[PDB]
Amino acid sequence: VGTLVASVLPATVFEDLAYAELYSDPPGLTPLPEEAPLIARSVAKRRNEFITVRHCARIALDQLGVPPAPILKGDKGEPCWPDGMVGSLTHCAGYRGAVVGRRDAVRSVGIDAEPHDVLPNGVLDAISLPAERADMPRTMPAALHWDRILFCAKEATYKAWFPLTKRWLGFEDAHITFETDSTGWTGRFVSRILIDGSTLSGPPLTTLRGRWSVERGLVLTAIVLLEH
Ligand SMILES: CC(C)(COP(=O)(O)OP(=O)(O)OC[C@H]1O[C@@H](n2cnc3c(N)ncnc32)[C@H](O)[C@@H]1OP(=O)(O)O)[C@@H](O)C(=O)NCCC(=O)NCCS
């Protein structure tokens, strides 16, 4: 279908969002000349996914009425969206995707995709708080890899946070609480910011609500912060 990420998008502002996803790199796709410098020293696997993900971004932007154009890279790797637009990009094995939104409705977007696979226990302690490790088993079905899902939400949280603050957010700086829908493979989370949430404009970031899904061997997460 090409609609997996829809499982983590809200209906509230759906008319002001667009998305596009692919599951592999179309062969022979050429980079835009203006984007080529961004991957001039990159390994082949990175080059290929970069091009595919940028292609998805333009497909999604086009749905919102934005003419196709290069998307450069700014502070700390963040994508440089066209004026009036926000969005987020992600890839992993078997997935490339873009979610974009109109800034008049959507303040920020953060998405992440991961394989639904375990993480090593050493990494878990580095990416989680004790309270998360205690609560996730209580809120998540035994079948799910809650370590990986937590991590996915941490990544979505950073991506939604950085464009608004331009500051680091570490794994210990957000406490994420989950809930599972009765059907067992989707739900909600809230990321509570534990540090100063001052933004370049608008209100401070204190809480970021998101959605998660597990389907087709993937974890997907998305945060869509509304403009009020
Ligand atoms: C930046 C980061 C979140 C990217 O996530 P990832 O799982 O490695 O890779 P993904 O494919 O999902 O996402 C990569 C895309 O993220 C976007 N991105 C990179 N830096 C970014 C930033 N500072 N802000 C917003 N988006 C960013 C880019 O569009 C990038 O793709 P591109 O280089 O092709 O444009 C991750 O690599 C990282 O450095 N994390 C540390 C910060 C963190 O997770 N903190 C926890 C907060 S609770």
CA distance 225 to 199: 13
155 lines ligand 1 (CB under 6 A): yes
Ligand 1 centroid to residue 159 C-alpha, Å: 6
Q: Would you give the end-to-end CA distance of the chain in angstroms?
A: 33
- Dihedral sign, CA of 147, 149, 154, 155? positive
Ligand 1 atom at shortest distance from the alpha carbon of 154: 48
Tokens of 224: 């869509």
Tokens of 12: 């509230």
User: After what residues is the chain interrupted, C–N > 2.5 A?
Assistant: none
Beta bridge partner(s), residue 86: 101
Note whether 152 and 112 are within 8 A (CB). yes
Ligand 1 atom at shortest distance from the alpha carbon of 173: 48
CA distance 202 to 219: 31
Burial grade of 81 (CB within 10 A; 0-12, 13-18, 19 or more): buried
Q: How far is CA 217 from CA 22, 23, 121, 144, 181, in A?
A: 15, 12, 20, 11, 18
**How far is residue 97 CA from its own chain's centroid?**
9
Ligand 1 centroid to residue 53 C-alpha, Å: 13
CA distance 178 to 188: 6
CA Rg, the chain, in Å? 17
114 lines ligand 1 (CB under 6 A): no
Ligand 1 centroid to residue 175 C-alpha, Å: 19
What DSSP assignment string belongs to 182-228? Answer: TTSSEEEEEEEE-S----SSSSPP-EEEEEEEEETTEEEEEEEEEP-
Note whether 150 and 128 are within 8 A (CB). yes
Nearest C-alpha neighbor of 206 from the set 143, 164, 178, 166: 164
Using DSSP bridges, classify how beta strands 95-102 and 17-22 pair: parallel, antiparallel or unpaired: antiparallel
Note whether 95 and 2 are within 8 A (CB). no
What DSSP assignment string belongs to 116-144? Answer: S----HHHHHHH--HHHHHHHHHHS-TTS
Burial grade of 58 (CB within 10 A; 0-12, 13-18, 19 or more): buried
Question: Helices 146-165 and 130-139 sit at what angle, rounded to 10 degrees?
Answer: 120
Nearest C-alpha neighbor of 19 from the set 77, 73, 49, 62: 62
